[PDB]
């Protein structure tokens, strides 16, 4: 828990909340990442909210949730580093964008992996009481899938009930994510939120591509039911004949 315990290899990403960098723990050479945050302009109130969230971040331990490792305060530069698991396969948004640009659909086997492992990640969250967007879902080097923590944008995954302001709402969002993985587009698209909301209320969308099994289409379609109580629970999802041991995480 000193910055000197790690060596930065290079920057992975930049943007709103400082930099994300790939680092190496000196003690044992383990490859990790950290988020570099400048809290210099923060009030005591804001810094307080920051402390509480980092504390909860330490609470979640699960193979399908991105693991938190450490927090380092550098009062000299008013920077806080949050050290997390490195996921070499990157995020799901990059995977979809890649597929969209290259014109190549993802394997059914890969979609089943994401369905199985994200459903389990969700199952864990629901127990505790965290958006299920592709940019927040990561892949490691071993076919494992991990859920990360985290106005202009279009709310593609907004559920019907949320639209008119529920664990079943999470199932809808999972539905949209799995749909987009298969179709390389969200089930409901629009140019404005008003248009989007109209489509969501009608609850109609294209079947996922024919390369995908009727069984997989069926379960995704069920998650996209207008009525929250017709959507399958995490338990009912995991009971599906499609889902097998090899779709689960492996060390
Ligand atoms: C090409 N482009 C694809 C995505 C990549 O970002 C990575 C790569 C490896 C990672 N190992 C753990 N993380 C986590 C990053 C994060 O928030 C930041 C983030 C989210 C989504 C896309 C990019 C980033 C970026 F800032 F790193 F760029 C996590 C969370 N909040 O739990 S976990 C990786 C992110 C590489 C660049
Ligand atoms: Cl295509
Ligand atoms: Cl396939």
From Swiss-Prot:
Positions bound to ATP: 12-20, 35
Effect after changing residue 213 to D: Loss of kinase activity
Species this chain originates from: Homo sapiens (Human)
Positions of the Protein kinase domain: 6-243
Parent-protein start and end of this portion: 3 to 271 of 445
Function, in words: Protein kinase which is involved in the control of centrosome separation and bipolar spindle formation in mitotic cells and chromatin condensation in meiotic cells. Regulates centrosome separation (essential for the formation of bipolar spindles and high-fidelity chromosome separation) by phosphorylating centrosomal proteins such as CROCC, CEP250 and NINL, resulting in their displacement from the centrosomes. Regulates kinetochore microtubule attachment stability in mitosis via phosphorylation of NDC80.
Effect of residue 154 to A: Loss of kinase activity
Molecular function per GO: ATP binding; metal ion binding; protein kinase activity; protein phosphatase binding; protein serine kinase activity; protein serine/threonine kinase activity
Phosphothreonine modification, residue list: 154
Membership in a protein family: Belongs to the protein kinase superfamily. NEK Ser/Thr protein kinase family. NIMA subfamily.
Record protein name field: Serine/threonine-protein kinase Nek2
EC number: 2.7.11.1
Activity regulation, per record: Isoform 1 is inhibited by ionizing radiation in the presence of PPP1CA. Its catalytic activity is inhibited by the inhibitor CCT241950. In the presence of this inhibitor, displays an autoinhibited conformation: Tyr-68 side chain points into the active site, interacts with the activation loop, and blocks the alphaC helix.
Tissue: Isoform 1 and isoform 2 are expressed in peripheral blood T-cells and a wide variety of transformed cell types. Isoform 1 and isoform 4 are expressed in the testis. Up-regulated in various cancer cell lines, as well as primary breast tumors.
Induction: Expression and activity peak in the G2 phase of the mitotic cycle and decrease once the cells have entered mitosis due to degradation by the anaphase promoting complex APC/C-CDC20. In G1 phase, both isoform 1 and isoform 2 are almost undetectable. However, at the G1/S transition, there is an increase in expression of both isoforms which then remain at this increased level throughout S and G2. At the onset of mitosis, isoform 1 undergoes a rapid disappearance whereas isoform 2 continues to be present at about the same level as in G2.
Oligomeric and partner information: Isoform 1, isoform 2 and isoform 4 form homo- and heterodimers. Interacts with NECAB3 and HMGA2. Isoform 1 interacts with CDC20, CTNB1, MAD1L1, MAPK, NEK11, NPM1, NDC80, PCNT and SGO1. Isoform 1 interacts with STK3/MST2 (via SARAH domain) and SAV1 (via SARAH domain). Isoform 1 and isoform 2 interact with MAD2L1. Isoform 1 and isoform 4 interact with PPP1CA and PPP1CC. Interacts with CEP68; the interaction leads to phosphorylation of CEP68. Interacts with CNTLN; the interaction leads to phosphorylation of CNTLN. Isoform 1 interacts with CEP85.
Post-translational modification summary for this protein: Activated by autophosphorylation. Protein phosphatase 1 represses autophosphorylation and activation of isoform 1 by dephosphorylation. Phosphorylation by STK3/MST2 is necessary for its localization to the centrosome.
Gene name in the database record: NEK2
């Amino acid at each position: 828990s000193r910055a000197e315990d790690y060596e930065v290899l290079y920057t992975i990403g930049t943007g709103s909340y400082g930099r994300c960098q790939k680092i190496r723990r000196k003690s044992d050479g383990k490859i990790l990442v950290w988020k570099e945050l400048d809290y210099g302009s923060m009030t005591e109130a804001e810094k307080q909210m920051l402390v509480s969230e980092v504390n909860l971040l330490r609470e979640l331990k699960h193979p399908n949730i991105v693991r938190y490792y450490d927090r380092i305060i550098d009062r000299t530069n008013t920077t806080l580093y949050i050290v997390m698991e490195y996921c070499e396969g990157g995020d799901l948004a990059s995977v979809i964008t890649k597929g969209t640009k290259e014109r190549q659909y993802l394997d059914e086997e890969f979609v089943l992996r994401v369905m199985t492992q994200l459903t389990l990640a969700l199952k864990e969250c629901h127990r505790r009481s965290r958006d299920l967007k592709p940019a927040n879902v990561f892949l490691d080097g071993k076919q494992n899938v991990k859920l990360g923590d985290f106005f202009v944008g279009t709310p593609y995954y907004m559920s019907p009930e949320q639209m008119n302001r529920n664990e079943k709402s999470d199932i809808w969002s999972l539905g949209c994510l799995l749909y987009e993985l298969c179709a390389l587009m969200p089930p409901f698209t629009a140019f404005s939120q008003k248009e989007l909301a109209g489509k969501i209320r009608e609850g109609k969308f294209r079947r996922i591509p024919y390369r995908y099994s009727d069984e997989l289409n069926e379960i995704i379609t069920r998650m996209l039911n207008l009525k929250d109580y017709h959507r399958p629970s995490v338990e009912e999802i995991l009971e599906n004949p499609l889902i097998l041991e090899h779709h689960h995480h492996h060390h």
